Amino acid sequence: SRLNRESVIDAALELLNETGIDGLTTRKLAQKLGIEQPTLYWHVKNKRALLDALAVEILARHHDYSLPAAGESWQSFLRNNAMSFRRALLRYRDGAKVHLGTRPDEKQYDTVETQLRFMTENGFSLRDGLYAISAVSHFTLGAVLAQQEHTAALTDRPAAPDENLPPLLREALQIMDSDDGEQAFLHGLESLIRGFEVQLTALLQIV
Amino acid sequence: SRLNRESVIDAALELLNETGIDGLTTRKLAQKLGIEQPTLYWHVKNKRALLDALAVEILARHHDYSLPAAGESWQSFLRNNAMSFRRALLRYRDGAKVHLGTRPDEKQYDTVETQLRFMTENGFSLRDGLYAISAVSHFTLGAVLAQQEHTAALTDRPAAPDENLPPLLREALQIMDSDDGEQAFLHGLESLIRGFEVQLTALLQIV
Ligand SMILES: CN(C)c1ccc(O)c2c1C[C@H]1C[C@H]3[C@H](N(C)C)C(O)=C(C(N)=O)C(=O)[C@@]3(O)C(O)=C1C2=O
Numbered sequence: 481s482r483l484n485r486e487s488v489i490d491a492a493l494e495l496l497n498e499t500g501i502d503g504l505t506t507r508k509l510a511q512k513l514g515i516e517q518p519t520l521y522w523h524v525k526n527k528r529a530l531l532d533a534l535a536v537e538i539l540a541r542h543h544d545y546s547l548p549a550a551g552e553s554w555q556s557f558l559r560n561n562a563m564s565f566r567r568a569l570l571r572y573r574d575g576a577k578v579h580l581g582t583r584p585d586e587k588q589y590d591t592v593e594t595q596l597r598f599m600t601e602n603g604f605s606l607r608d609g610l611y612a613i614s615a616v617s618h619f620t621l622g623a624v625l626a627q628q629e630h631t632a633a634l635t636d637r638p639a640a641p642d643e644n645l646p647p648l649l650r651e652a653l654q655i656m657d658s659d660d661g662e663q664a665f666l667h668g669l670e671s672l673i674r675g676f677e678v679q680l681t682a683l684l685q686i687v
Numbered sequence: 688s689r690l691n692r693e694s695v696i697d698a699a700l701e702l703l704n705e706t707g708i709d710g711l712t713t714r715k716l717a718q719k720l721g722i723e724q725p726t727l728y729w730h731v732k733n734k735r736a737l738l739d740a741l742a743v744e745i746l747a748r749h750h751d752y753s754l755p756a757a758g759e760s761w762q763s764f765l766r767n768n769a770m771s772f773r774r775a776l777l778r779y780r781d782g783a784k785v786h787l788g789t790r791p792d793e794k795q796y797d798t799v800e801t802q803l804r805f806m807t808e809n810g811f812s813l814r815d816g817l818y819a820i821s822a823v824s825h826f827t828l829g830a831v832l833a834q835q836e837h838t839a840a841l842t843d844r845p846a847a848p849d850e851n852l853p854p855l856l857r858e859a860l861q862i863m864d865s866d867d868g869e870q871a872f873l874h875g876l877e878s879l880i881r882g883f884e885v886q887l888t889a890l891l892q893i894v
Pocket residue numbers: 539543545546561562565582583584588591592595610613614616617856859860863
């Protein structure tokens with residue numbers, strides 16, 4: 481099949497959804513594409529370059545809320561931003577493991593820059609705007625990794641069904657796995673944003 | 688060398704610090720221990736059982752603040768808890784990648800149970816206590832993964848040194864990598880806790 485950037489990325493994401501990150505290799509990618517490894521090598525040097533590119537593309541394709549709406553509050557933008565980040569990461573198997581250790585790509589510079597200018601225009605210093613952005617990303621990444629990687633681990637070996645857990649831990653785990661972890665996440669996200677709001681409004685006051 | 692649980696775990700953590708999670712194998716563990724693979728297999732069935740055990744042991748050894756102090760506020764306990772969780776995860780290379788997708792171990796039941804009882808005795812429902820605990824873990828895990836995995840990625844290929852970044856993104860990344868990410872983390876952690884505090888005190892009031 482065809483080996484332009486787009487087709488290589490499409491085949492790569494298919495294979496990622498078939499086999500997960502740890503068994504995504506240039507060997508199996510070559511196989512999926514019906515080509516010899518030294519053909520693929522012309523197009524994709526290594527698994528790292530491949531992972532770097534999927535990270536960027538999963539967002540370009542599926543992270544629809546990168547930009548604030550005209551007039552949107554910074555709280556609403558961080559919420560809508562986080563929800564969209566979470567969506568994009570969950571869309572492919574081990575997606576958050578793919579995102580891990582990427583930095584914004586040149587094709588995301590203007591997007592990430594705008595996001596920081598927007599914060600700073602709402603009364604954040606660069607530094608608190610940065611911390612808010614970073615906290616939202618790290619929170620959202622952990623929440624999606626815990627969920628994806630809890631799941632991957634269960635494929636490999638089960639858990640004790642209850643007949644062994646102490647009572648609170650027993651009902652806590654029933655609750656946290658009764659949706660995908662979406663309510664733990666949406667609740668944590670409100671706590672985080674209100675925390676940034678309390679910090680920002682305080683200004684020089686001891687808070 | 689000796690193959691009791693303790694010695695296998697010690698050798699495993701050494702190898703983890705030498706080679707990272709992705710090149711930690713039962714082959715190289717057998718080599719490190721100076722034994723044949725079918726000898727190791729008696730002791731350790733697979734990489735999963737091995738990862739499950741290192742996850743538990745890295746905490747037992749190095750997560751000193753699992754328990755609140757008598758009289759300690761829930762805010763102070765979540766802070767001291769998170770800081771200690773972060774420490775334990777950073778102590779070994781790809782440590783957070785090791786923790787990912789573990790659930791509390793039987794030898795951590797009484798610890799995690801106590802943590803939930805403590806929250807609920809401070810006025811959290813099980814559910815908000817749970818969300819607070821989960822948010823603190825997911826935040827702390829993302830923060831440590833972003834840092835560890837940003838680092839692992841740099842071994843594999845560098846970044847653009849500045850002569851290409853737009854201005855805010857340029858100075859943001861200088862700031863966020865001028866310590867290990869410890870100030871982004873400690874700031875995010877205060878925002879999260881104050882957010883849980885605002886939620887809890889509100890009770891039935893629209894907040
Ligand atoms: C400059 N800024 C503080 C940093 C620092 C370190 C980082 O590792 C990153 C950023 C920007 C953030 C912005 C976030 C943004 N959001 C908070 C989720 C975001 O929506 C995007 C995006 N491309 O739309 C990211 O690049 C992003 O996911 C991302 O991957 C980032 C990222 O990796």
